[PDB]
């Protein structure tokens, strides 16, 4: 079984978000943080946790959401969309249509490609 | 944020299933395996993995599904409903209604209680 991913822009960068209902908090790898020019945003008063990003822009389809990220030193996925965000947006994970419903957007999960 | 749980009977025992789209495989703790009289079912040709249960009965609402379990020595959750099962049943995680749609069943997630 392939994991669940959607396309998203975080702070205007196109990435692949691993959708994970078993995760309390949306998180991102330090390597991904670099790749999105987000290192400057990092509040280092948090801390293996690199830090916290209080405000970042999520672009999903043609919708825009503020969200927070926790940056980890090393992580298996680069970007992990968590339950925090899922519950906040009363998103629907429909594995019948194979898409994520988040407000007026319906975004398909990617195939292994 | 509270995690996602539903009520289910596995092999006629009432339990609380942690719903987790970020998990490839449905798994169960060794302690939970004991608590469901499932230790006998365990194929020890697998192995920290205690073993694999090839066939177990899931009762969700008034529906019945065969499923496999991987038994782990120690685990944070006791029973974890995975993507394997979610994708297999084209289940829908609706955090708008706060329920799991799996065929003709719609089961509510539990509150912190």
């Amino acid at each position: 079984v392939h994991m669940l991913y959607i396309n998203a822009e975080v702070n205007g960068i196109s990435i692949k978000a691993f959708v994970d209902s078993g995760a309390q908090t949306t998180i991102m790898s330090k390597k991904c943080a670099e790749k999105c020019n987000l290192v400057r945003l990092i509040d280092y008063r948090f801390s293996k946790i690199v830090g916290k990003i209080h405000v970042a822009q999520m672009k999903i389809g043609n919708s825009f959401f503020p969200f927070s990220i926790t940056v980890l030193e090393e992580s298996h996925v680069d970007f992990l969309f968590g339950l925090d965000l899922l519950k906040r947006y009363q998103c629907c994970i429909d594995l019948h249509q194979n898409a994520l419903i988040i407000g007026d957007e319906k975004v398909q999960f990617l195939s292994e490609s």
Side-chain angles (χ1 to χ4, degrees), chain A residues 1 3-15 17-30 32-34 36-47 49-73 75 77-86 89-105 107-113:
Chain A
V1 186
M3 300 329 288
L4 287 201
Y5 291 96
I6 60 152
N7 274 122
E9 271 178 29
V10 169
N11 273 13
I13 285 94
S14 281
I15 68 182
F18 175 69
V19 180
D20 194 3
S21 62
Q24 200 35 73
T25 310
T26 298
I27 62 77
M28 190 177 259
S29 82
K30 167 77 190 338
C32 198
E34 299 154 10
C36 294
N37 312 299
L38 294 196
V39 309
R40 41 173 67 94
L41 283 83
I42 294 182
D43 175 16
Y44 293 86
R45 289 187 294 89
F46 304 68
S47 80
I49 302 190
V50 179
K52 184 194 187 33
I53 298 176
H54 296 276
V55 184
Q57 197 196 60
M58 173 85 91
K59 185 184 159 48
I60 293 165
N62 318 290
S63 309
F64 295 90
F65 322 97
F67 74 103
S68 317
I69 331 189
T70 302
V71 185
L72 299 165
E73 202 60 68
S75 173
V77 287
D78 269 354
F79 179 57
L80 198 165
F81 190 118
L83 192 44
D84 49 4
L85 258 68
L86 281 161
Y89 291 109
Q90 312 162 4
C91 307
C92 290
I93 305 189
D94 174 5
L95 299 170
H96 182 260
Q97 273 153 169
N98 201 64
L100 177 53
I101 291 69
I102 179 170
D104 295 333
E105 313 283 338
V107 184
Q108 291 280 313
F109 304 109
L110 314 176
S111 57
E112 212 288 311
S113 4

